[PDB]
């Protein structure tokens, strides 16, 4: 008896090790998938920072141009009011 | 023959255990990796918003440079017509 029973246990263990390896293999594959997603984080962060700095250079330049545009507009409006009078 | 099997069985038992600890370690890694990956859509939407803010800003700025030039020519042409 003892010999075939041990052999049965061993086969059971050996087959269970296959089922364990199968889950490991699937988990490792998902971890490869995950690592790629996670690797975009610094790129997305660098990309946001870049666009943020360019936005801010443009906003600063555009603010300085409303000031002089309103002044040109006022001088034009005032000059138009004189010509229409005389 | 028989003690060989007994010792093979014991190695298979330790291997079951060492495989399950690998599985458990892989599972808890996936847990902390899920957190990190759930930041991604927000970082994506952030990059998108700055891009849109930058493109609208650039466009508004190029328009304004053209309008400034335009007003300056009108101020000068209205002077010529003045005189």
């Amino acid at each position: 008896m003892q010999l075939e029973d041990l052999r049965q246990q061993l086969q059971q263990a050996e087959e269970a090790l296959v089922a364990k390896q199968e889950l490991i293999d699937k988990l490792k594959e998902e971890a490869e998938q995950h690592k790629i997603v996670m690797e975009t984080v610094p790129v997305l962060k660098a990309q946001a920072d870049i666009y943020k700095a360019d936005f801010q250079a443009e906003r600063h330049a555009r603010e300085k141009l409303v000031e002089k545009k309103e002044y040109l507009q006022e001088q034009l409006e005032q000059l138009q009011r004189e010509f229409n009078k005389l | 023959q028989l003690e060989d099997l007994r010792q093979q069985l014991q190695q298979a038992e330790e291997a079951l255990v060492a495989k399950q600890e690998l599985i458990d370690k892989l599972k808890e890694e996936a847990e902390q990796h899920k957190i990190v990956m759930e930041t991604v859509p927000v970082l994506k939407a952030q990059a998108d918003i700055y891009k849109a803010d930058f493109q609208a800003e650039r466009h508004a700025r190029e328009k304004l440079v053209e309008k400034k030039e335009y007003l300056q020519e009108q101020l000068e042409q209205l002077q010529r017509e003045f005189n």
């Binding site: 263990a13 050996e14 087959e15 090790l17 296959v18 364990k20 390896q21 199968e22 | 060989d4 010792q7 093979q8 190695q11 298979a12 291997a15």
Partner: peptide
Amino acid sequence: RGRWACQSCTFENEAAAVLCSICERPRLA
């Protein structure tokens, strides 16, 4: 049993081995 060649890394293992000595994969995987 006899020696067995791991089907993943090709290492020739001892008959008694349950996992591959090198890549650690089970004999029947």
